[PDB]
Design a protein around this ligand. Structure first.
Ligand SMILES: Cc1cc2nc3c(=O)[nH]c(=O)nc-3n(C[C@H](O)[C@H](O)[C@H](O)COP(=O)(O)OP(=O)(O)OC[C@H]3O[C@@H](n4cnc5c(N)ncnc54)[C@H](O)[C@@H]3O)c2cc1C
Ligand SMILES: Cc1cc2nc3c(=O)[nH]c(=O)nc-3n(C[C@H](O)[C@H](O)[C@H](O)COP(=O)(O)OP(=O)(O)OC[C@H]3O[C@@H](n4cnc5c(N)ncnc54)[C@H](O)[C@@H]3O)c2cc1C
Ligand SMILES: CC(=O)N1CCN(CCCc2ccccc2)CC1
Ligand SMILES: CC(=O)N1CCN(CCCc2ccccc2)CC1
Ligand SMILES: [Br-]
Ligand SMILES: [Mg+2]
Ligand SMILES: [Mg+2]
Lengths: 483, 486
């Protein structure tokens, strides 16, 4: 069968691309994915990683985990109830999450059924030749052929996959993929990794753990959440700790064996030991290029295994493009979507457009959460002669009453002190992901600190901190910090 | 006894002007207020209306009220407990709020002690002459003079005060002032008014009411929250109704009598009656100009009672300025603060600057809340030939699971369709007040709809809806609503 466009991977970026090419540019579009609904065996499915085993379900589960804080915090505001009657029913959370995800699966299924010139094929897509995608029964390239798709243009949009360290007893560990389907909440869990997935799951497990349970997070480096503002890294560490999570920094699993009762016995490189019910590996995500048989067409890969692309998402092979996590640029759903739209505009619209991967608002749904956009000060300080940092940090008043006095709000604006241009905004605290969105629009408009402090605050909010900072807290001059 | 600046009212506007003048321009400042800490008899005190009986306590009490929804909503996420054991302890809330407010009162007292040339005087400020403020023991111009302050410059910042309709039995009613100090949560309460104060208090009372409780909100016209986006006004109405609040529109109390049990028998203009434990009037606030004896220096007031000011907060009388709610414009703390900051950066910084009263981000801590910045479409439609309305409205997924299906999120962007310039942004839903703040920065920067849609979303958030809207839902063409442009 012959298509203007064949998309391999029905995820965030692949669906934006396929829908746009079919509906905006009237192209005949094929999209391939390995599953029509979420979960084992392949986890991602129609809708992509975000829908099935990422942003959507994780946000629902963090929302669930937040009620542990709300129930406790209610008491400061006079709420009374039987504390000993309180149970976090993980089974109900997972069932609620499963229905929400399946509903999305079903709506995408209906989208394909109802959208003419947009066709879904089930199975494993690989490149036979530069204008032929082959859809097979399994990831094994010797499995039965279901379809052979003639394609003027081919989009690679297969996303990423959890990285598992080749350590002894790796087989006794899970990734985030399995964590979404645990039938029971682990009493003891080790999250391995200092990144958003490890931190976010540490919070989920911490809220739903059965009585006398314990969540441990381990990270090889000295301070979790590299890439984030350093004050926020230190505070999120303190605030996880204050809510009963054990943060093991400078620690990495050397191996895992089973205790006789089937629990996991962890030996760290330091020779510390930890017995847990679950070991969740969240140490990285790698582009999914193995199954694509890219050797058949000579698409250029990085040693990492990403598809190398120009700024327009073009491979070295004419008519073959890649967007989203498979490109290893920024692994966020809205970025994959933006890359997919820009690619289709460029190729089928002759409306040349590239995704700006700078000044991208993002969030960590830690408890409490992070919202960030643009450069951290250390990075700005290497690129700009004079950098100013405006900082406001304090326990919000509601958290003096709630009894969570450890919940320090942090708001930091990083500027080019030579002209006041805002380079980065970094927030930690309730509402941070919601606050930062319109800050993304500010950084696109080259907002200066004067644009923030001359804007009238909304009161009372956490956000108004951003519009109340007149005077730098400190500077970097030629890369050096000056009070 | 001689000051560069004398400020009457140690409130949102007065303290910003006072502090800035002292710390930025090393000026010598007297600030007058009638009370050093919150509550009866005068309610406002050191820190002003917002701190003592406004934004600050209101927000703590709405946060308390929100736990009624969180406790219920938790069940959808698997939280289990004895719902029959749930009690809302209003007495606990009010003690916690009192302690919170007193700490802020004491924190401002510290500010005045620890600041050279910034001094607090206790008592009632009035104007004797163009350059003399007298501080008296009471609001009576005949009470004892505690002080005579000479002033190169005089700032009036005495704020506002609740209006009580002169109906028979108004003495059985309270304002928001008394609501902060009720010893017990009313079982039955009538909030009178369709504005943010009546709406916010209906939410608060609704969460803390004892068993067999009922919150009724009445409003004299057809739809609450005049001046907000119409879609949001209708939606808040539904969402308050869905959470058990009774909205009586086209209704207004004609009188109140005490029943023998101390309850209130409200008779409406329509002839309807209602028994309630509390009648809270929230029909408006009026500038506090009476007690300043403004007739003594001929400071001009408006056809409404607010101190007349130019764009620089200058009265008709040289050396005399007015900021905040006494000017009877936008009654918001950050506007009062902006006016004070501008007035002092102007008069003492020699850096003239005027408050922009357009494109002001504001909120209603309704449950769920409103966040808004700039023009509603009806207003835009009268100023601009072609207005586009971009609208995204849905129950967020978390609220399909929570069981609060009625919590429809609303995001509306109003543009000048001629150039795409965003004229207003109107949000209803959890986090709306937090979302809207950086939208105020966007509007200052003359953001277009294309600046919103070309910005990459933060996922998953409600806020990313603002960056997902590319196509108008409908238009106004020369004042006329229509699906499609000609
Ligand atoms: C736990 C977790 C949480 C996350 N949270 C967030 C968040 O909160 N916000 C955010 O913005 N991002 C988040 N992300 C990242 C986000 O999920 C990804 O950036 C995004 O899904 C990538 O989109 P994409 O189009 O590159 O690929 P994906 O959405 O991953 O889609 C790839 C698809 O290709 C399919 N596939 C793979 N190989 C083949 C093949 N050979 N043939 C056919 N189909 C194939 C897969 O089944 C999958 O559906 C999260 C990720 C994870 C793992
Ligand atoms: C219930 C309620 C909720 C509110 N919620 C919000 C909100 O969430 N967000 C928001 O932005 N705004 C809110 N407001 C409005 C906000 O409180 C005001 O806009 C703000 O306080 C006005 O500041 P100001 O400087 O005009 O005066 P105020 O802050 O009102 O200060 C005036 C002060 O002057 C003193 N005073 C009066 N007369 C004299 C005299 N003769 N001599 C000496 N001292 C005198 C008073 O004691 C008072 O302390 C709310 C108001 C109320 C009533
Ligand atoms: C608890 C705390 O330390 N902070 C929270 C409040 N922050 C608000 C700053 C702006 C503002 C708003 C309204 C009145 C005045 C000023 C300042 C820092
Ligand atoms: C009906 C509903 O629940 N809505 C919330 C999500 N809205 C889309 C937000 C942007 C986005 C993010 C990720 C994939 C695609 C688009 C659309 C409206
Ligand atoms: Br580190
Ligand atoms: Mg179809
Ligand atoms: Mg002093």
């Amino acid at each position: 069968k012959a298509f203007d466009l064949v998309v391999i991977g029905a995820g965030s970026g692949g669906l934006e691309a396929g829908w746009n090419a079919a509906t905006l540019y009237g192209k005949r579009v094929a999209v391939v994915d390995v599953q029509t609904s979420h979960g084992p065996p392949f986890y991602a499915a129609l809708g992509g990683t975000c829908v099935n085993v990422g942003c959507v379900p994780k946000k629902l589960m963090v929302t669930g985990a937040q009620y542990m804080d709300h129930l406790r915090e209610s008491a400061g505001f006079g709420w009374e109830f039987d504390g000993s009657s309180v149970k976090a029913n993980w089974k109900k959370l997972i069932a609620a999450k499963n229905e929400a995800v399946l509903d999305i699966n079903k709506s995408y299924e209906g989208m394909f059924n109802d959208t003419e010139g947009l066709d879904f094929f089930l199975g494993w897509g690989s490149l036979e030749s530069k204008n032929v995608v082959v859809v097979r029964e399994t990831a094994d390239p010797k499995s039965a052929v279901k379809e052979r798709l003639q394609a003027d243009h081919i989009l690679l949009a297969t996303g990423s996959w959890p990285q598992m360290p080749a350590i002894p007893g790796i087989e006794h560990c899970i990734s985030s993929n399995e964590a979404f389907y645990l039938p029971e909440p682990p009493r003891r869990v080790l999250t391995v990794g200092g990144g958003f997935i490890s931190v976010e799951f540490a919070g989920i497990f911490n809220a739903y753990k059965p009585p006398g349970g314990k969540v441990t997070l381990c990270y090889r480096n000295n301070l979790i959440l590299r890439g984030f503002d350093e004050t926020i890294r230190e505070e999120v560490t303190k605030q996880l700790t204050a809510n009963g999570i054990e943060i093991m920094t400078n620690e990495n699993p050397a191996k895992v064996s089973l205790n006789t009762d089937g629990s996991k016995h962890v030996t760290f490189e330091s020779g510390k030991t930890l017995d847990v019910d679950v070991v969740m590996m969240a140490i990285g995500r790698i582009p999914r290029t193995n199954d694509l048989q890219l050797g058949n067409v000579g698409v250029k890969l990085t040693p990492k295994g990403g598809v190398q692309v120009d700024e327009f998402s073009r491979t070295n092979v004419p008519n073959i493009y890649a967007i989203g996590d498979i490109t290893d640029r920024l692994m966020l759903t809205p970025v994959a979507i933006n890359e997919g739209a820009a690619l289709v505009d460029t190729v089928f619209g002759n409306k040349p457009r590239k995704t700006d991967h700078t000044r991208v608002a993002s969030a960590v749904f830690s408890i409490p959460p992070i919202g960030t956009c643009g450069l951290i000060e250390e990075v700005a300080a290497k690129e700009f002669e004079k950098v100013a940092v405006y900082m406001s940090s304090f326990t919000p008043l509601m958290h003096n009453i709630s009894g969570s006095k450890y919940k320090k709000f942090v708001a930091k604006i990083v500027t080019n002190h030579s002209d006041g241009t805002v380079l980065g905004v970094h927030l930690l605290g309730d509402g941070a992901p919601e606050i930062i969105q319109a800050v993304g629009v500010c950084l696109r408009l080259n907002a200066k600190i004067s644009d923030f402090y001359n804007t009238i605050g909304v009161h009372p909010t956490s956000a108004e901190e951003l519009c109340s900072m007149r005077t730098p807290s400190y500077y970097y001059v030629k890369g050096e910090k000056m009070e």
